[PDB]
Amino acid sequence: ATYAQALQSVPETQVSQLDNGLRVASEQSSQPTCTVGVWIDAGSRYETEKNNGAGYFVEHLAFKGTKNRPGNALEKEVESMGAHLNAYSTREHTAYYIKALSKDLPKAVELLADIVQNCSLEDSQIEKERDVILQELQENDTSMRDVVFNYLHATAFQGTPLAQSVEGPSENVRKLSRADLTEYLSRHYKAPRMVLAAAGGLEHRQLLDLAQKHFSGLSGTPTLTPCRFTGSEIRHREDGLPLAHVAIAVEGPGWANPDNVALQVANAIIGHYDCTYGGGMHLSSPLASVAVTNKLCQSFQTFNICYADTGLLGAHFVCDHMSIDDMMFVLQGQWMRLCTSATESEVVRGKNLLRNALVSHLDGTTPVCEDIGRSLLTYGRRIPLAEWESRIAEVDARVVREVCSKYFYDQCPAVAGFGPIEQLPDYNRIRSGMFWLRF
Amino acid sequence: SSKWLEGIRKWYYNAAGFNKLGLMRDDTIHENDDVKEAIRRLPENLYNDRVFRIKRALDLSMRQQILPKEQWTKYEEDKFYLEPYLKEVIRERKEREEWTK
Amino acid sequence: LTARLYSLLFRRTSTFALTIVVGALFFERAFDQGADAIYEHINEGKLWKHIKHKY
Amino acid sequence: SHTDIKVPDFSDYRRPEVLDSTKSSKESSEARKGFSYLITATTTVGVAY
Amino acid sequence: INIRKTHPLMKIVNNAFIDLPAPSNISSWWNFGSLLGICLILQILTGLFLAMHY
């Protein structure tokens, strides 16, 4: 069929509210599965100065023991019922989810609610997890990419606590004390900030009743404040590295604007080309044809990060140290061509690719359940596919060049360079070439 | 008719010049991006025959002397070897142009 | 005052060139008149325009 | 390694308008832009005349 | 990519003035090469006019 008939058949994301600050979201579907997750909006953005990254310390210390159900017994029961327990964390949020079958849901809500409300600290285990965090900072200095992105956030938001790093300094790691971590647990992870999601071929009312059972008596009853986008530069001269990693970003809109929808169309236009794609020369985006014809970059991802009505909008390119300035110039030329001489065919192609990418995204257990999570983080609801289809159809080329002139033209970026990056010119060259004076 | 056009083509070939200097049709072409692309798409032995005939012609123009009478590669054995490749090159160039219109 | 000025005269390059040329002509006007006025005001007395006024 | 990187602070250099860390700078941007571009415009007008 | 990095005159201008690796240390005492250049072209032009009326 077509868009109306297919987009009409989509489940409504049956929401409900548990009456202490809990938002529960079920998506009854037609496949035999369940994915059950707890999202608590707790990251470095909510954190203080002298407890930078203690939520990461929590998501290490979370599974290793509670007051009613022990830690080895926890993962033992996970392996007993055939589940897939998993957890992650941003600078703002925190997620603990379980991939299982829907009959394993009562044991799931059991163990996961004990994880929510009755965690603990074990001092020998806390020294062992301190050593684990040291070893993992050691083994995650290796991959250059999130080093570049943490580096980029730290130079983009200077002085403000929004660029508190994800794991703090090392001396901060070796002094996150027991009383301060229990204080962190008592302050943050409790009432107003939690979404309990359940996606699959499941039921709403029985899960509602058993969540009313397990979340009985939370007793939880000033944060999330804005910050400054400075705009700056940092360069790591380190010539013992094989390739060059350079990212540049401007201030992004956030969540609650159609500007974010127009910039999602723009980041569908530009994207992330990666070099190992089958065929490189004849790609539709002219940036792709140029950067492959002159063989400049090794990759580039050109994208948007949306924090709570704030955030970043930008690009990271990986290239050899002889193709920095040409890559930089053609990237700026693509941005200013979207600004000043925005045509129609590029908006058509960006809308086709953004529709196809979002439809191919919203499938499977983990992406749809994380869509439920990241929807109910700030939206106050979950947005279905039809409303994003409408807000894609509501933008023509004129609004696209309005948004690009609104955000990109003649700005103060944030540049993070990493590696053999000597050929990158000085910052005022990027400033005076960032806006077109028509060369 | 057909006897008229072939006689004209033979007269213009005998008075053209490149029969004297030991070349063919495709030897005397002017080169742009498309023609150099078509040269790049050539078979190897035909490419080597092409560069040997070109170097003989540059020799003949160097001492300003023509090959003798029978050593002229005459009409109706001229090799139109670059014809389908360059034909497809110009066709695909027009395809790119009318796609990017 | 400032954001209105950036909105009007500092978006594209041709408008910036036009407004600096128009500013140059208005500066020509006011600057020539003020310069000649102050110059002949500090040289009042034995300047030629007094004698042209008499004669 | 990179998590130990602590950026220095530059309040000896910054503008006093943007000594406010919480209040975001999507608002006083055109003020700074029109200020500096008015200075460069006055410069170019004088040089052109 | 660029007309400046590829044109065989703008290559000369680029490796003279645009992308010359210059020190980050020199004071006003190093301006005098450009000052002698501008004084020399000023002498050329004013001498040209004075030689037109002489």
Place this chain on the structure above:
Amino acid sequence: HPQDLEFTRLPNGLVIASLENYAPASRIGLFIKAGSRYENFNNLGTSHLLRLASSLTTKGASSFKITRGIEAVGGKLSVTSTRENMAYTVECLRDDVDILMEFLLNVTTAPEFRRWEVAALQSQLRIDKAVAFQNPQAHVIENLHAAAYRNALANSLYCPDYRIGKVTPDELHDYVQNHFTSARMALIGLGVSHPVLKQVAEQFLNIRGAKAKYRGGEIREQNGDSLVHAALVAESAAIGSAEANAFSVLQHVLGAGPHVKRGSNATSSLYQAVAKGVHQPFDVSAFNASYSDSGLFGFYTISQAASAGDVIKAAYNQVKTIAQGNLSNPDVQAAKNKLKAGYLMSVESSEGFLDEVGCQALAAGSYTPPSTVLQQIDAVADADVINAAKKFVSGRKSMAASGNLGHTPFIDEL
């Protein structure tokens, strides 16, 4: 949604599954039994070349028209492959299926294979080979398949060194002409109707080697990164058999990758045995790849360079003491639920559904529902587990190794 997918077998031999759910994510998979095991010593490393052949010119659409039409309608063309099978998958919206169907028809049923494209693709072969073999696990598994077969399954996914550049498009002509037969194709459509797929795969193809013996032997990669990668594999079973499902029970008994993220993994036998024996950081998992005529089962260890021998000896003693008949029956049911969780929540994504459903429907000649698969999982006894473990201990030895080899039992104390 009370609907279900539809099996159909077109009489030249091809297998069509059709599905119509009212979600716009339309996927067309086309799986071909012309994998790397149908190539010989004359054309070593040709499957990687033919896999990277997306941007060809077709007799009906030139290559610029193909790439720009696909990326202008916004559809994605991926090609994924194993030693048996190649997979042309295309995903898009249901308003994007006719023209991408026509491009997929062009890619399959229209080769041209001209030469400058082949040379640029040779450069691309070295690029993709570098990005592939810069992760050590794939190289260890390729040396493993070269270390256990004396025959056509010892060929690689990728290409070897000297054949880069030397391979000619005329072998591509010959291989595509006499190895793309109509009886060996599986068209798996999801989101589109059945009779349009039937018309296309009915009027638009019209076309139409021995076993791989076990070898036994070892292949070593002195590479020196202080991380021993050792795969100890014997021959197990062909695909589909209840003995092979007992091998699946056996690998879920012995233990797989960490289901708990940052987990001690107590249900695994090998990791708990060696971590109870060796106080160093490591990882030990199982591995099983069953094939159309043979199979491979073993255990895969990643360890330090100091104490790899303690790891291999403790793992081998653990496999022997399990093979002599020590296994708890609720732990066997926990392994059966591991296999249930694997078969369900590995193919619940549309990628995994398309992949395994198409590979079975091309392999088994039918479609099998998930519930009867779960019942045939649960209908496996314990004598098969004990006999498969005795079969692994008593069986002949294949070994792939990479790293500092100075702390490894080689032949004697395997």
